[PDB]
């Protein structure tokens, strides 16, 4: 009904109401997968405790699935889709309606993590994590901008395309084609703002 908080240590304890609503919606689909039992009070009541160690737990949830994915590998990683390892955790960032990083704190932590992941895995002769392919709609989300802007950014040569398409065809938004390390670096280099 209102916020009214002070000494807001948890990442769920600050902000405008729309964000506070979005954070709960996200928590629910992701951890309350059990079918509705109209436990309208009890089901959501737990979300606050959950977030109290967030700055240090979210990363472990992401780390766990890097390893479980790795041991099930069937192709060299540089032809593997980003989605096969992280399971659309990126798309879920779109459920909070705000676009910028300083307000959408879920996206802010996911990017933090991916930047570190790339940093500890530099390029060498054998491919490794960080060379995964992103689709056009994924870069748009990580770069905090609409899709048409990515097409314009490609056209000017600020980033490379890795898969050669056939002639008399087009690459659709859903096709996986940019390397992760290329997107992370470009964003640090030329996409920052006061937000």
């Amino acid at each position: 009904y209102g916020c009214s908080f002070e000494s807001s240590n948890p990442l769920l304890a600050i902000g405008s109401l729309s964000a506070r609503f979005g954070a709960l919606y996200w928590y629910q689909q992701r951890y309350l997968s059990d079918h509705e039992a109209v436990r309208d009070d009890r089901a959501l009541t737990k979300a606050i405790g959950h977030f109290t160690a967030w700055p240090d737990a979210f990363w472990r949830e992401l780390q766990q699935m890097v390893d479980d994915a790795l041991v099930r590998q069937t192709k060299p990683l540089n032809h593997t889709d980003f989605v096969d390892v992280f399971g659309s955790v990126v798309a879920d960032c779109r459920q909070i309606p705000m676009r910028n990083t300083g307000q959408n704190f879920i996206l802010k932590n996911l990017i933090g993590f991916l930047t570190d992941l790339v940093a500890r895995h530099p390029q060498c002769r054998v491919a490794n994590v960080g060379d995964l392919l992103l689709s056009a709609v994924d870069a748009a989300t990580l770069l905090s901008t609409s899709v048409e802007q990515v097409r314009r950014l490609h056209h000017e040569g600020f980033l490379p395309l890795s898969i050669r398409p056939a002639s008399r065809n087009t690459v659709s938004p859903h096709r996986a084609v940019f390397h992760l390390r290329h997107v992370v670096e470009l964003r640090q280099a030329r996409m920052q703002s006061h937000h």
């Binding site: 490609h154 056209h155 000017e156 040569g157 980033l159 490379p160 395309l161 050669r164």
Partner: protein, 300 residues
């Protein structure tokens, strides 16, 4: 425009050959080993006890962009002639000569084989000059060259500026470079294009084979001096009518922008007018560069 219009090439190398010296003979070729395994595997590396590898090629330059090889239209011809001369007398050939000359002295025509313990480049010409770059590993596209080296760039620029602009001068250069190498360092010659891979060689007059780099592969490196687009110099592109960029799979002067050769070719009447009022803009530099790499400009 008109139906027939052509220019021929005004600047060209022959091919590059790799070899080394012995105490017994001055020219021993670097050779390639093949195992039939058809579907083969093959290798090439400097053999034990050879301390340095030599690479050599020749270059001719001709003042051949002053006039259309073929033109079917008297009005198109009158203009193209007036334009080349309007440009020549204001300078600008110096600029093109500076750019071409810089690339020869830098050594980028060695492509993937630049990684040595020290590369020395020596140039001789038909007018009696000799130039010497003691170490080619440190010269950038953009930056001020160290003393005594900046100077030879100016001197070479002058000889070439003439070769490009005045007829009946027969100007040849002979370029040899030395690669100081590693213990058994791998060498990267041109590959064969096929419908596993094979490498390219040439035959010697005595029947031996040698590793080489193709003519146009040397040429593609020399003419890479297009950085006049988007007010952002970066690195230069190989001159192309559409501004193609192979690394990024794109095109910088896509016809959709109005910045390609063919749109620009039709404004010649306006450029001559400006030159007469003259400062040289990027638009006329681009055009002159394309005329030097001549080809077919037809079916208007």
């Amino acid at each position: 425009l008109c139906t027939h219009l052509s220019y021929s090439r005004s600047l060209s190398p022959g091919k590059a050959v790799f070899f080394y010296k012995t105490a017994e003979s001055d020219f021993v070729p670097l050779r390639i080993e093949v195992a039939k395994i058809p579907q083969t595997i093959e290798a090439c590396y400097v053999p034990p006890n050879v301390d340095e590898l030599y690479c050599r090629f020749s270059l001719r330059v001709e003042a051949n962009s002053m006039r259309p090889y073929v033109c079917s239209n008297p009005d198109v011809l009158r203009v193209m002639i007036g334009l080349a001369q309007a440009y020549q007398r204001l300078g600008g050939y110096n600029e093109l000569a500076r750019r071409y000359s810089a690339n020869v002295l830098r050594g980028i025509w060695l492509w993937r084989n630049q990684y040595t313990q020290g590369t020395k480049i020596e140039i001789k010409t038909s007018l009696g000059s000799t130039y010497h770059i003691p170490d080619a590993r440190r010269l950038s596209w953009s930056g001020d060259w160290p003393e005594l080296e900046q100077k030879q760039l100016e001197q070479l620029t002058s000889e070439m500026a003439k070769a490009l602009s005045q007829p009946d001068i027969f100007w040849f250069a002979d370029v040899t470079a030395s690669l100081k190498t590693g213990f058994c360092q791998e060498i990267f010659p041109s590959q064969k294009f096929t419908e596993s891979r094979q490498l390219a060689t040439v035959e010697c007059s005595d029947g031996q084979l040698a590793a080489c780099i193709n003519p146009q592969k040397i040429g593609a490196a020399l003419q890479k001096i297009d950085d006049w687009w988007a007010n952002d110099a970066d690195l230069p592109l190989r001159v192309h009518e559409y501004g193609a960029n192979h690394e990024a799979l794109t095109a910088l002067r896509h016809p959709a922008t109005g910045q390609d050769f063919y749109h620009l070719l039709t404004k010649a009447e306006q450029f001559v007018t400006v030159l007469e009022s003259s400062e040289l803009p990027g638009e006329v530099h681009y055009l002159m560069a394309v005329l030097v790499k001549g080809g077919l400009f037809q079916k208007g």
